[PDB]
Amino acid sequence: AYTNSFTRGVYYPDKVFRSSVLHS
Amino acid sequence: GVGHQPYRVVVLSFELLHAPATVCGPKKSTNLVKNKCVNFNFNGLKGTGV
Secondary structure, eight states: OOOOOSSOOOOOOSSSOOOOOOOO | OOTTTTTOOOOOOOSSSSSSOOOSSSSSOOOOOOOSOOOEEETTTTEEEE
16 A cells, blocks of 8 residues: 655754754 | 785774764863853864854
């Protein structure tokens, strides 16, 4: 069977604290 | 020959990153000063500020 991800699986790319920013 | 002689090779790899550090040099830490424009050296990160 199959199902949808529904925008899941996002992890922290690095170990640096960033606050209130749009980071690519 | 000299080129055919065996050699012992040691390769050291470092994880230089913005991460907590467990291997550090023989530098000795000092006291902490707040609310004053001073030079600082935090785990090899050097700077000047408050």
